[PDB]
Design a protein around this ligand. Structure first.
Ligand SMILES: [Mg+2]
Ligand SMILES: [Mg+2]
Ligand SMILES: [Mg+2]
Ligand SMILES: [Mg+2]
Ligand SMILES: [Mg+2]
Ligand SMILES: [Mg+2]
Ligand SMILES: [Mg+2]
Ligand SMILES: [Mg+2]
Ligand SMILES: [Mg+2]
Ligand SMILES: [Mg+2]
Ligand SMILES: [Mg+2]
Ligand SMILES: [Mg+2]
Ligand SMILES: [Mg+2]
Ligand SMILES: [Mg+2]
Ligand SMILES: [Mg+2]
Ligand SMILES: [Mg+2]
Ligand SMILES: [Mg+2]
Ligand SMILES: [Mg+2]
Ligand SMILES: [Mg+2]
Ligand SMILES: [Mg+2]
Ligand SMILES: [Mg+2]
Ligand SMILES: [Mg+2]
Ligand SMILES: [Mg+2]
Ligand SMILES: [Mg+2]
Ligand SMILES: [Mg+2]
Ligand SMILES: [Mg+2]
Ligand SMILES: [Mg+2]
Ligand SMILES: [Mg+2]
Ligand SMILES: [Mg+2]
Ligand SMILES: [Mg+2]
Ligand SMILES: [Mg+2]
Ligand SMILES: [Mg+2]
Ligand SMILES: [Mg+2]
Ligand SMILES: [Mg+2]
Ligand SMILES: [Mg+2]
Ligand SMILES: [Mg+2]
Lengths: 70, 116, 87, 101
RNA sequence: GUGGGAGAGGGUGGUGGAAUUCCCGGAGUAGCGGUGAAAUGCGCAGAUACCGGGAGGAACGCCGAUGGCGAAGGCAGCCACCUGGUCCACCCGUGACGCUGAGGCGCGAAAGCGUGGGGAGCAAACCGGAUUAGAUACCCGGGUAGUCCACGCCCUAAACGAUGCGCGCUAGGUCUCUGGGUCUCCUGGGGGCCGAAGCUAACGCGUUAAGCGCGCCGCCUGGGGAGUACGGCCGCAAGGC
């Protein structure tokens, strides 16, 4: 399976307003994806998590979602 | 006396009981059933067969209301949490989609001693 | 907090000669600056205990440096103490 | 004076009089607290991920400013007191940490 | 000193969503809950389930790790402000200014105390239902203090790495966090795992020493009696030394 960073450009991990790329790092639900599927380093993941929470509080990223086909 | 022709179906399954509430596309309920609505009384209500019978009874009451297309919402976990959906699929109601909306907190409340 | 403007102001004020950075005089001056900053931070925020431990350590270091200065040259020690208003 | 980024999400349904009024009130708040406005980006209508104040959409504003530090919280409060302003997040500016460089 | 860096380090104020409970409303019948079975309990004054709205308290899912920070206790949503510690590079400044530390002083999980707030959920005591030869327990239903906050006390612990602090010396390999570098790698500084020499009663330790040395502090001298008695000190008390 493909990791998120493998298929992506040279993007800003500190931009909480870019929903297009931050949506890639969320799961089918609103959960943040683990490093196994994001292909990020520890520092990169640590920054991404905080930017994702920032975007969430601004109503740009979903706090949680609903699972399908279950 | 409603002629709803379409709606939602919520399956609340626990380890002590499984209940099915068939509702309309904007949230209000139409009919419902459970393991106690049907004959079973005690722990018998938590078996998958009771969940199947409850789903089928609720689906037939929906037929009495005139239900054809059904969207499924699932909350909880227990024996027959899947058997309810299986019977609901083979009940004669065209299943639109299945959704698991089990409410999980963000670590808000302190559980009972059983749950720690 | 303490930006480079204030820091360099104090350093150029307490230098033994142009270019000096780590003289005992300059060390005690910068120490006393951070001491006063923290002690004013601890006038409010009486429940900040870890910063209070940091203040204890800063006091200890400043006192050690002043003891050394007093042991080596008493006159420069008096000058420093009078210039900073300590002890 | 440090560099900050003010995000403002307010009611989308406003017309031009109301929107210009709220925007000029934000401007007056920035003036009164010593906020030098370096740049501005107005996104406007956007689809929220979750409903905010019973509304599925919101109107967005982003201001990069330079203002004194001890006034940031009071400025945030004064910005929040307005009814139509539903979200205020003041963020200290930072450098663009990149990935997959 | 300069210039960079990582962080649930601390304090203050703000702020977000999920969930529980409760209240208002809509729609909707006959049970829900709970257990190994059950019963107390709740439900026709309309519950449970579903939908919308409101209130309030407490805690922060995914990220999260075998991770990080702190002297220890301990510290996880987000934002801002105040502030501590620490690491690296530059080789710039002072010129032994160092190490330890009886006493003292400060900090010190939880529970507990006092005054005043707060109170969703949980829950000693307690009230019931079961189980049993009996049930004063485990299991179920309730439920107060408390848990939360402000301020002042309390000074205990498996307060654990059961390993005091500092420095130097003594094979490496592997995983990792964070810096620098001419960036298959090297070089620092933290977190683990194997294992040289050596150590150990053995288990095991092994550049994060329990190895080889040095300095300083604390403590030990058979078990029970007993962390008891007396005395002193501290404490509102419980009680602690
Ligand atoms: Mg049952
Ligand atoms: Mg507002
Ligand atoms: Mg912190
Ligand atoms: Mg903090
Ligand atoms: Mg009602
Ligand atoms: Mg009744
Ligand atoms: Mg009754
Ligand atoms: Mg009654
Ligand atoms: Mg209340
Ligand atoms: Mg986890
Ligand atoms: Mg700092
Ligand atoms: Mg030199
Ligand atoms: Mg010289
Ligand atoms: Mg010492
Ligand atoms: Mg001592
Ligand atoms: Mg204590
Ligand atoms: Mg306590
Ligand atoms: Mg109390
Ligand atoms: Mg309870
Ligand atoms: Mg109980
Ligand atoms: Mg009995
Ligand atoms: Mg020793
Ligand atoms: Mg590198
Ligand atoms: Mg450490
Ligand atoms: Mg190492
Ligand atoms: Mg050997
Ligand atoms: Mg070993
Ligand atoms: Mg050693
Ligand atoms: Mg030994
Ligand atoms: Mg003793
Ligand atoms: Mg004896
Ligand atoms: Mg005792
Ligand atoms: Mg005696
Ligand atoms: Mg006594
Ligand atoms: Mg007395
Ligand atoms: Mg005792």
């Amino acid at each position: 399976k493909a990791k998120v960073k493998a298929t992506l450009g040279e993007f800003d991990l500190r931009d909480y307003r870019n929903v297009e790329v931050l949506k890639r790092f969320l799961s089918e639900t609103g959960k943040i994806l683990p490093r196994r599927r994001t292909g990020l380093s520890a520092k990169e993941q640590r920054i991404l998590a905080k930017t994702i929470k920032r975007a969430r509080i601004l109503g740009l990223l979903p706090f949680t979602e609903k699972l399908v086909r279950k | 006396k409603r002629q709803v022709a379409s709606g939602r179906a919520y399956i609340h399954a626990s380890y002590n009981n499984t209940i099915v509430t068939i509702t309309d596309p904007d949230g209000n309920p139409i009919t419902w059933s459970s393991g106690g609505v049907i004959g079973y009384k005690g722990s018998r209500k938590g078996t998958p067969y009771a969940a199947q019978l409850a789903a089928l009874d609720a689906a037939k009451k929906a037929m009495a209301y005139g239900m054809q297309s059904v969207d499924v919402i699932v909350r909880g976990t227990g024996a027959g949490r899947e058997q309810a959906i299986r019977a609901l699929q083979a009940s004669g109601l065209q299943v639109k989609s299945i959704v698991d909306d089990t409410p999980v907190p963000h670590n808000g409340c302190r559980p009972k001693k059983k749950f720690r | 907090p303490i930006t480079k403007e204030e820091k360099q102001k104090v350093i150029q004020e307490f230098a033994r000669f142009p270019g000096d950075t780590g003289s005992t005089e300059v060390q005690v001056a910068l120490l006393t600056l951070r001491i006063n900053r923290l002690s004013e931070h601890l006038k409010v925020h009486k429940k900040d205990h870890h910063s209070h431990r940091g203040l204890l350590m800063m006091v200890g270091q400043r006192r050690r440096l002043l003891r050394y200065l007093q042991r080596e040259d008493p006159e420069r020690y008096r000058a420093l103490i009078e210039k900073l208003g300590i002890r | 004076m440090r560099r900050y980024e003010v995000n403002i999400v307010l009611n989308p349904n406003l017309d031009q009089s109301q929107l210009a009024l709220e925007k000029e009130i934000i401007q007056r708040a920035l003036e009164n607290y010593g906020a030098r406005v370096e740049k501005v980006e107005e996104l406007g209508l956007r689809r929220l991920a979750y409903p905010i104040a019973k509304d599925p959409q919101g109107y967005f504003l982003w201001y990069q400013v330079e203002m004194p530090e001890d006034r940031v919280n009071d400025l945030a409060r004064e910005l929040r007191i307005r009814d139509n302003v539903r979200r205020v997040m003041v963020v200290k500016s930072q450098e663009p940490f990149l990935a997959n460089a």
